[PDB]
């Protein structure tokens, strides 16, 4: 599986047939048909206290992993029950400016998303939490083009030692509250992993205000490889899914 024309996004249901479930991820999200949802709390975040391990380039992206034997970093409250602990976090974006996030709002297009995933400590591990459909929940940060992110430098100067498929970096001290926006207003859904195997285990948050990256930032994250060091070089470059049918499913709003 990956991105390109032989083995993109629409031949993954051959080895993956849940690819066109119902209720696949990402989607577009139409603001007028949204539900304003009064019910919902506000979401809880505890990263004080997170603890990031590592940075690798996994051949479709770039994860940066956290240690999750305790609830050092997690997220609770919104339309989630119990305690989700964070994981990992997952970059996606394109080859251009105007492409490169999975999920869209009113059919706009951001530069790139950012996933950070957590898993329902009730299963015990993320293996158990991926077999329930209340197993994960991800928080969807849309990237615009517009002034540096300080916060994300940490992440772009370490990139060159990464370059190539399957090489990993030690990435220590590394403060995820860094890559938050100033809002907390979010929609929510019940969806999918975004890439295989493409699981129907999550409950979606994507934050309305997206984080604003400079040029430079997002250009180093287009000089990754999708290839093995030593093999012809491929630009990891559209990483992301095209929207999927809502289906039936309902998007709500907690603003
Ligand atoms: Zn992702």
Redesign the pocket.
């Known amino acids: 599986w990956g991105y390109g024309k032989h083995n993109g996004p629409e031949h993954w249901h051959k080895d993956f047939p849940i690819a066109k479930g119902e209720r696949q991820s990402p989607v577009d999200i139409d603001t007028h048909t949204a539900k304003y949802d009064p019910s919902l709390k506000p979401l809880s975040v505890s990263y004080d206290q997170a603890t990031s391990l590592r940075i690798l380039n996994n051949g479709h992206?770039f994860n940066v992993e956290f240690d999750d034997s305790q609830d050092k970093a997690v997220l609770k409250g919104g339309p989630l029950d119990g305690t989700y602990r964070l994981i990992q976090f997952?970059?996606?974006w394109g080859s251009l400016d105007g492409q490169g996030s999975?999920h869209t709002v009113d059919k706009k297009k951001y530069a790139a998303?950012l996933?950070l995933?957590h898993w329902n400590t009730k299963y015990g591990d993320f293996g158990k939490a991926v077999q329930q459909p209340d197993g994960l929940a991800?928080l969807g940060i849309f990237l615009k083009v517009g002034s540096a992110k300080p916060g994300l430098q940490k992440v772009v100067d370490v990139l060159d030692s990464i370059k190539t498929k399957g090489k990993s970096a030690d990435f220590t001290n590394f403060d995820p509250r860094g890559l938050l926006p100033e809002s907390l207003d979010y929609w929510t859904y019940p969806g999918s992993l975004?890439?295989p195997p493409l699981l129907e285990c999550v409950t979606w948050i994507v934050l309305k205000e997206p984080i604003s990256v400079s040029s430079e930032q997002v250009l180093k994250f287009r000089k990754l490889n999708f290839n093995g060091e030593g093999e012809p070089e491929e630009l990891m470059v559209d990483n992301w899914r095209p929207a999927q049918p809502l289906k039936n499913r309902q998007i709500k709003a907690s603003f």
């Open positions: 992206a997952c970059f996606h999975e998303e996933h995933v991800v975004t890439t």
